[PDB]
């Protein structure tokens, strides 16, 4: 956060990395291989 000087870019305007999403869900304890995030990933 730097809300004094600038606004935060909306989350929908930045494409999320599949590696970071998989890492976060794997830390949360979700079997990513059983759900197939690669198919949902765009290119």
């Amino acid at each position: 956060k730097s809300l004094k000087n600038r606004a935060i870019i909306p989350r929908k305007a930045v494409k999320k990395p599949l590696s970071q999403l998989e890492d976060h869900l794997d830390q949360l304890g979700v079997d990513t291989e059983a759900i197939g995030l690669r198919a949902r990933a765009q290119t």
Partner: protein, 155 residues
């Protein structure tokens, strides 16, 4: 690679300032290949150029301060800086009071609570600063009607 022209064109297309234009730092070559407003619009549709949102300016503290000044806080002699007439004009107060009194007198004369002679003398007393407010005028009218009723009963 220089992107000043692309930033200016993106600002003109998005209808914002040049400080609100965000150019993708990872696809600089494709942004530099855009030399026309059609290409800039195509990159905006692709999401490579976006308009940054406005910086925060909230009115929340002003609204809480307005509520505090409404319920009566921060009105003390340490808070007052202008003179009493500068804060609230006696001319505006007199205008409000005279309009209230004349409106009430017109309403009473229309409804028939008073006649035109009582209306005229009460009008000139209101102009001559006899009544402080509507309650004072109403009490004076009630006392005058009571005295007239007593005189009629005596006669």
């Amino acid at each position: 690679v220089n992107l000043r022209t692309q930033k200016r064109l993106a600002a003109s297309v998005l209808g914002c300032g040049e400080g609100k234009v965000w150019l993708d730092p990872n696809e600089v070559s494709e942004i530099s290949n855009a030399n026309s407003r059609q290409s800039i619009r195509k990159l905006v549709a692709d999401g490579l150029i976006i308009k940054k949102p406005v910086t925060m300016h909230s009115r929340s503290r002003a609204r809480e301060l307005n509520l505090a000044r409404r319920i009566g806080r921060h009105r003390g002699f340490g808070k007052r800086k202008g003179t009493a007439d500068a804060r609230m004009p006696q001319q505006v107060l007199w205008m409000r009071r005279q309009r209230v009194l004349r409106r009430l007198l017109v309403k009473y004369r229309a409804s028939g609570k008073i006649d035109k002679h009582l209306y005229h003398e009460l009008y000139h007393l209101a102009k001559g600063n006899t009544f402080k407010h509507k309650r004072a005028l109403v009490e004076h009218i009630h006392r005058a009607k009571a005295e007239k009723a007593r005189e009629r009963q005596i006669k």
